[PDB]
C-alpha cells in the first residue's frame, strides 16, 4: 500500500469494478479498498453460484445468499416468551438485546434491508437479472431532449451490457420456460409482450451456466502483471473506509481514513480522484460520518447546510411473490403430438410423434425430447425431461402494468422449500412495484449507536408513500395473481405475499442524482461527481432518483461508465 | 497434470492433507484431486469462519454450513399436499421425484447424512473439536500391551494436535465460559472432570479466533515454490475420482480413473501409491465403483469375495441437543463481590467492589469487568460484559457417562435463531452417543440409480442397535437434562430433543481398521492398507471400527500419520 | 345462542371442530425418525389411530365431516341460506 | 369457523373473511361407498371417498373464482398475512 494513488475507489462490486475496468484500462494508478475479503475462490470477486457442486445442487444455494446477507437496522425485539423454567433469569423490560437499534421505529423500517460484505459485493450471489428502465422509470441525462437522451442512454446500456455479458438466449430451449412463455403471450395478446429476463450469463454446456458478476466487469487482479503489463490497481481487502476528509470550502477531498481490520493499523491514503461505490446505504454512512449531511435523528429546526437531500427520498420497491404448480392443461400440452398407447410400464406401451406433421403444435426437437423422456422414463408420470432448464421469463414495466416482473426459478427462495411437489411442476412469481421518492422517507445514522464496524447505526424512517405507489403495489399484486393462475394454482407455502420491506434489496435515492441541487433536491450532477466536489464521485443505486421497479444494477452501471467518462475528460493520470 | 506421479490423493479434507503434509514433506512428487472447488479465499482449503464479517456476525455462519451440506440418501416423500388448485396437475401415486433416492428404506435411514464437496472438505466448515479417544473408544494399534499401545497413541496424537494446533487455552478469560465450567465442576465434584473443549484454532485477538482447517494441516499451494523450492505437489479441483484398477490377483492398484468435471474429458492416472481420503460415504463409493465389496442390495445368497466387511458394520453416534437460558442465581453470581447501591440510571446508582478482598469469589480481572460494564451500561440489565466470549466446555466420555459432551455455543444452530432471549443467557447442550458396530448396519450402493455424479446411488440400512447403544443414547438424554438444570432452564424452541440420524456426522466404520480381515471383520489393517494390496491406503473416520462418543477427526488423523509412516517405510520417492 | 359465546365469539371455532369427526382418514405416512432410539416403532407405515386402509389418500375429501349430536350440524352452523337461481337448482 | 390460528396483532375492526364455493358438475367416476371389511366407530361399514374435482369446467371455474376472489378482496384491503388466498381441504 502507498499513500498517494491516481484515483481510489471505496468498494468492490460491480459499480466499483466499472470504475475499475474503466479507469485501469485508461492508465490511472488505482487502488480499490474492501471492507470485505476474498472468499469466492481464485477468480476475485466472481459468482458463488457458478460451482459444478452448486449448479448440481441449485436449491442449497438459499443458504449461500442468507449467509451474507446482514440486516441493516433491527428493531428492539418486544416477543414474550413466558414458557422459561422459573429458575431462568428474566429481564423485567425489553431492553436493548442482540445488536438491536434502539433508535428504529420497528412501524416505520425496511426491515429487510440487508447488506454484503464481502469482495465483489452483492454480485457474488445476485440473481443476474439486468433490464433497462424505459423512460418513465429513468432519470433524465439530457434535459429538453428526448431523442438525445434516449441516444445517451442506449450507448451506456449497450456498454454496460456488453460488460456484464447480458444476453436473452440462454434458456432458449427450455421446454419449462417455452410452456409458460408461450401461454401468457398467448393470453394477455399482445396487449403485453413477454421475453426471457435479460440475464448477465453465458452459458457452458445445457446444464451449466457461467453467472456474470462484478468479476466479469474486472477481474481484480493486482496490476502490473503478465496479461497488462502497463496498468496499474491494488485491492486492499479487509480495509474499513471511514471518512473522506473535506477542505474548509466543501470544494476537494483531501484525503480518505482507512483502518486494516487485520493489523488494527490506521491511515490516510491521498488521490486526485475518490469513488465512493459502498452500496446504497454505506456510501450514505460514509458521508454522513465525513460531516456531509446530518448525524442523528433528522431535526428540521437545524436542517443540514451541507447535501441536505442526502438520506432523503430514499425508495425501495415494493415486492409481491408466489408460487405456482402447473396446470394439467400445460402439462398435457408438452405432450399434445404424442400418440400414447397401453399403460406405463406395461409390454405394449408406446409414445410416437411424426416428425413435420403440419398439424404438429411442437417441433421436433420438443417432440423428440418429450418422447424419449416419456419411453425410457415410464415409472416418471410428467413429460418434461429431468434436466429441463427452469423458465426466465419477464413482461417489462409499462405504463398500463408500471411493475418488473420475473417468472421462473429463483435461487433465493423464500421460506422452507418443500419437497413433496415435483420442482419441474414448480414457477415463481415475482413482482417489483415502484415507489415515488418523497422527502419524509429517510435513511439516517445514530449519533449515539454504533453498527459493528464502530461507524454510526443506520436507522430507517420509511413508509411506502400513501397514494400512486400503495395504490399500485395492490394493483401489481392483483396482477400477479391473475397472470399466475394462468400458469397453475398457487402452491400451499408459497400463497401470494407481500414480503418484508427491503428483501427487494433495490434501495435507491439515498445520494440522489439530478441537475441541481436545490431545484432537483439531489446531491450529484449527471457525471455522478457531488455538487460543489471538484473529485469526489458516488456510483450505486443510491444515484438513481426514479420511481422505478425494474432491477437497478445495469441503470447504476451506465451512471457509472458516463461518471467514469467525466473523469476520463478532467484528470490525467499520472505517469507509469 | 502429468500421468505419473509418486502418489496420488483423492480428497482434500483434512485427512488428505494429513497425508500431503507428510509426503510432499519427505519428498515424494503428490497429486492430490477433488471433486469440489477452490471457494475459501486465496488460503487454500481454510476454514470460513475466519473472516471479519463472519466472527462479527456468527449467528449467519449456520446458513454457511447449510449451503454445503448436501443429503446422501433421501426417500421418496409421501407427503399428502391435498389443498392445490383443482387446474393444477398432480400424479396418482408417490413417485420417485425430487433426487430422491427409491431404495432407500425411510425408516432404516440415516436422514441426516450429509457430504461436502469443495477444496478442504467439511474443514471448511468445522467445529474443530479436537478430543483423544480414551481406551473404551479406541481401536487398539499394538495388541497384547496395553502400555505400548497407550504410548503409541499418545505419540500419534500429539502430532496430530501440532499440525491442528489443537489448545485448551483459548476461551480462559471469558465470564460465561467460567460461569458454566465452575458451576458444573462444583455440581459432580469430582466424580466427573470439566474443562474446556480441546479445539484446533487459535486466537488472534479478544475478539478474533483463527479457527483450524486442512489449510493449518498443508497449506495446499502448488510446488515447487518459493516457500518450498524442492518439493513437489499439484492440487487438481473440481475432478471426479471415478475408479481405481485392481489387477487380476487383487494385489496392487495399476492406475485411477478420473473425470476433468469443467472440460467433460476422462483421464487414467498412474502412482506408486494410492490413498482415498474421500470421506466415509464417498471412500466406500469409489471402492464399490471399482469392484470391491458388492454393487446392489445386499444378497446373503451371494457373499461378496472382495473385502466382504466393506459396507457393514457401519457406526453414527446418537445426538441430543438443547439449549438453556442462564439461571438467576448464576447471573446474580457474576456481580455476588459488589455492592451496588440505588437504582440503574439514577444519580446516586453505583457498583463498586474492593480489590483483593479475601472474601471475594471473583478475582480483580473479572470484577473489573463487571463493575465497568454495569457502570458504563446502565441501560443494560445483565452484568455480563457484550463481547464476552461463548462458553466451551465439556467432560470427556467415561465408562460411568460414556457420551462425549459439548456446552456452549456453536455455530450450527438448529432450527430457527430466537431473538427475543439476550444471547449472553443462551448455552447449547450437545452430547454424542457411541454406537455399537453390527454387521446389519451397512451402507450400499445401488446398481440402477446414481447420483448427481453419475456413481452408484448411496442407500443407508441401518438401525441404532436395540441393547447397549439404545440404553445408553436414552441414559444421555437424561444425562443432558439433570446436567443442563444446574444451568439453567431450557430455552423454548430449543428443548431436549434428538437430532435427525447422522446429522452429527460422525459416521465411521464403513472401512474399517483390524489386525486380521476375517477374524476383525475389516478391510484396512493398522498402516491403513488395504487387505491383500500394496499400494492401496484409506484415511478417514471410515477406518474406525470402535463404538465412539467424540468427535473423530483427530483419531482419523492419528491413524493417517501412522500410515504415512508406513509409506515412507516402504516406497522410495522418484529424483527430482 | 349463549351470551357467553357472543361476548366472546372467537372461541366459537373450537365448538365447531369439537364436533366435526372426519369421515375418512387416509393411512398416516409421515416420517418421524427423530425418536430416542429406545422408543419402539415398526418397521411399515401401518392401520393406525382410525385410518382407513381403503382410502386412496390422493382421491378423497379429507375435509368431510359429520356430526353427531340432537340437531346436527345446525348446531354451529353459519345459518347462510341463499335460494338457488335456474342455473344450481333441479 | 376461523381456519388456522387466530392472530391477534392485527384490530379485528380491519380483518374481513372471504369465502367463495364454487360449483362441481356430477360425474359416474366421483363415489361414495363402503367398505366390506372395514367398520367406522359405531360398527357400520366404513365410508371410502373416491373423488376428484373435475378436470374441465369445474377445475376452470374453480381457479376462475380464486382469481375473483383476489380481484374482488383487493377493492377492501390487502391480504392478512397468516390467511392468504389457499384453497381449503376438499
Ligand atoms: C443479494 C441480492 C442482490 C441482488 C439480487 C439478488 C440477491 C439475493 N439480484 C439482482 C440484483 N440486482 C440486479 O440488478 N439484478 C439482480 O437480478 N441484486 C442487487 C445487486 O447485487 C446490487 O444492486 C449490486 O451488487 C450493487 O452494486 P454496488 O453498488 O457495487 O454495491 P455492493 O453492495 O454490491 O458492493 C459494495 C461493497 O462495498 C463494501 N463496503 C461497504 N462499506 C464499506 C466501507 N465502509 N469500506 C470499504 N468497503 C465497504 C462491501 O463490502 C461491498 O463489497
Ligand atoms: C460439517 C461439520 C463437520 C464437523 C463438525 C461440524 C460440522 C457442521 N464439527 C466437528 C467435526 N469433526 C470433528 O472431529 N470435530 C468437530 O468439531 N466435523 C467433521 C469433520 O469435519 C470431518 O470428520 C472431517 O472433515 C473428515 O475429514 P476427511 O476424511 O478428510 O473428509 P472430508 O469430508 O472433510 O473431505 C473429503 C473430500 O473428498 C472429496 N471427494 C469426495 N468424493 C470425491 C471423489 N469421488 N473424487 C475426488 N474427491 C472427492 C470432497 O469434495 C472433500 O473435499
Ligand atoms: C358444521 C358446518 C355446517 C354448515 C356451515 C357451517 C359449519 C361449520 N354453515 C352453513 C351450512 N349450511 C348452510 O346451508 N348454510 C350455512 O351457513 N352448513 C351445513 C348444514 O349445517 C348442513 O347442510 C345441514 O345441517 C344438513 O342437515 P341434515 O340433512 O338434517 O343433516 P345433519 O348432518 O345436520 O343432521 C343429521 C343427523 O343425523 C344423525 N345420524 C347420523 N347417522 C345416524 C344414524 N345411523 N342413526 C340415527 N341418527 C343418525 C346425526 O347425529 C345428526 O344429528
Ligand atoms: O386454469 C384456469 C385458467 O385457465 C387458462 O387456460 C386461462 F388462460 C386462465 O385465464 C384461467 O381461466
Ligand atoms: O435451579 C435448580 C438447580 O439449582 C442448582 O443450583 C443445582 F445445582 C441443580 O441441581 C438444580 O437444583
Ligand atoms: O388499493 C388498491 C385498490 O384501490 C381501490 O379503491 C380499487 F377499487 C381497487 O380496484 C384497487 O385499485
Ligand atoms: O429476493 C430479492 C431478489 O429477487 C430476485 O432474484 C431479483 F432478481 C433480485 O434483484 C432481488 O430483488
Ligand atoms: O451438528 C453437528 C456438529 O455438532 C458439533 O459442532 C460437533 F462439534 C460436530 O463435530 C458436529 O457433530
Known sequence: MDIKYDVVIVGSGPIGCTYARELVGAGYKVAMFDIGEIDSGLKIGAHKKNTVEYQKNIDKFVNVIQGQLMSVSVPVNTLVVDTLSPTSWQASTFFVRNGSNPEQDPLRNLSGQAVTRVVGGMSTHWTCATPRFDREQRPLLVKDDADADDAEWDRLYTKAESYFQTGTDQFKESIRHNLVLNKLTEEYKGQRDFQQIPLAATRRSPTFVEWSSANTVFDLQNRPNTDAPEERFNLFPAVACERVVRNA????????????????????????????????????????????????????????????????????????????????????????????????????????????????????????????????????????????????????????????????????????????????????????????????????????????????????????????????????????????????????????????????????????????????????????????????????????????????????????????????????????
Open 249 to 576: 470550502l466543501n470544494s476537494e477531498i483531501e484525503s480518505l481514513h482507512i483502518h486494516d481490520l487485520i493489523s488494527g493499523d490506521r491511515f490516510e491514503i491521498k488521490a486526485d480522484v475518490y469513488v465512493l461505490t459502498a452500496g446504497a446505504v454505506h456510501n450514505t454512512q460514509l458521508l454522513v460520518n465525513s460531516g456531509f449531511g446530518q448525524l442523528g435523528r433528522p431535526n428540521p429546526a437545524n436542517p443540514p447546510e451541507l447535501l441536505p437531500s442526502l438520506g432523503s427520498y430514499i425508495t425501495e420497491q415494493s415486492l409481491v411473490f408466489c408460487q405456482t404448480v402447473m396446470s394439467t392443461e400445460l402439462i398435457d400440452s408438452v405432450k399434445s403430438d404424442m400418440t400414447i398407447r397401453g399403460t406405463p410400464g406395461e409390454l405394449t406401451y408406446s409414445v410416437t410423434y411424426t416428425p413435420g406433421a403440419s398439424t404438429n403444435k411442437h417441433p421436433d426437437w420438443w417432440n423428440e425430447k418429450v418422447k424419449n423422456h416419456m419411453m425410457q422414463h415410464q415409472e416418471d408420470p410428467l413429460p418434461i425431461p429431468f434436466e429441463d432448464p427452469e423458465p426466465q421469463v419477464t413482461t417489462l414495466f409499462q405504463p398500463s402494468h408500471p411493475w418488473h416482473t420475473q417468472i421462473g426459478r429463483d435461487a433465493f427462495s423464500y421460506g422452507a422449500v418443500q419437497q413433496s411437489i415435483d420442482s419441474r411442476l414448480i414457477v415463481d412469481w415475482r413482482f417489483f412495484g415502484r415507489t415515488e421518492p418523497k422527502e419524509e422517507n429517510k435513511l439516517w445514522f445514530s449519533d449515539k449507536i454504533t453498527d459493528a464496524y464502530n461507524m454510526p447505526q443506520p436507522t430507517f424512517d420509511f413508509r411506502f408513500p400513501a397514494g400512486r405507489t400503495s395504490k399500485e403495489a395492490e394493483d401489481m399484486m392483483t396482477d400477479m395473481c391473475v397472470m399466475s393462475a394462468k400458469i397453475g394454482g398457487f402452491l400451499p407455502g408459497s400463497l401470494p405475499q407481500f414480503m418484508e420491506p427491503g428483501l427487494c434489496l433495490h434501495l435507491g435515492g439515498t445520494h440522489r442524482m439530478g441537475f441541481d441541487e436545490k431545484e432537483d433536491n439531489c446531491c450529484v450532477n449527471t457525471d455522478s461527481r457531488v455538487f460543489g466536489f471538484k473529485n469526489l464521485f458516488l456510483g450505486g443505486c443510491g444515484n438513481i432518483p426514479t420511481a422505478y421497479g425494474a432491477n437497478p444494477t445495469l441503470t447504476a452501471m451506465s451512471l457509472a461508465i458516463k461518471s467514469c467518462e467525466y473523469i476520463k475528460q478532467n484528470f490525467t493520470p499520472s505517469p507509469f
